[PDB]
Amino acid sequence: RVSHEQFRAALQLVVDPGDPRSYLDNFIKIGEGSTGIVCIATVRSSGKLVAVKKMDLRKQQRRELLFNEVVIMRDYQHENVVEMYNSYLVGDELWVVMEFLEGGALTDIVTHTRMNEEQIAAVCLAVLQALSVLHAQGVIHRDIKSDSILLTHDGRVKLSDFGFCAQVSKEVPRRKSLVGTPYWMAPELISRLPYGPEVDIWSLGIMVIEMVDGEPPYFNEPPLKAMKMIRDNLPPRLKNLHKVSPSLKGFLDRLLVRDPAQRATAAELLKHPFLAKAGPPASIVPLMRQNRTR
């Protein structure tokens, strides 16, 4: 394991030089994240909001993840992936300056209201389009869940929160690391087996359950207990199974497949006729907190 000094030096070569407090002001904390805190700030010259994630290099279990997030954000851009404007080192902190997405996170929708199948298909389609491109390059997100799905003001999906991502290669085609969010984790990953991009497809299935049911399976169990049930049991069932179409159930059945070798890929899923239901971005807008009644 390389020293802090050597890790920082490596990271320093890939981030933008300088101090971002020269450009940004009016910092407001908005959250505790997956490897740090998240703020909003205004860019001095425009008065435009940006999001800024701050991660302490010295308080990370897997520092390499900081490096991964920066490099993947720099090199693998997509219309359905959150944009990184710049990154900086400020002492022993990594700051990542991101676009601010006015729609907020999908979690806020699934916990406050009920999506219809056209809306569910729109979200799935957009996530799958991003994943197909990312997976083709060996990038694994490893933390798919509604919290990682952000929405623009006009209802477009942006996959976000690459703080736990990895990249596989011909030389090192699988990862073994037990990482993610307990209730969303793929059974192969919980089992600490060599895994690949397929883990994201399972996680997406659990997010479909969120979109139908409001919460993932086993959410009331201690995390290690939930992980045992995902590992050992038949795939989780929709609590609101009675509400769903044959197309949706057929779709979900291709995601929540325990053997990763039998699980559908993102590229296969883009052709599933459930996604023919997808509404446009205008269909998501009324779900967002700023438009909700009640």
Binding site: S34, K145, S177, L178, V179, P182, F219, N220, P223
Partner: peptide, 11 residues
């Protein structure tokens, strides 16, 4: 436990 935090458990 209804916690939504991402976690690194092991390499």
């Amino acid at each position: 436990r209804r916690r939504r935090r991402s976690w690194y458990f092991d390499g």
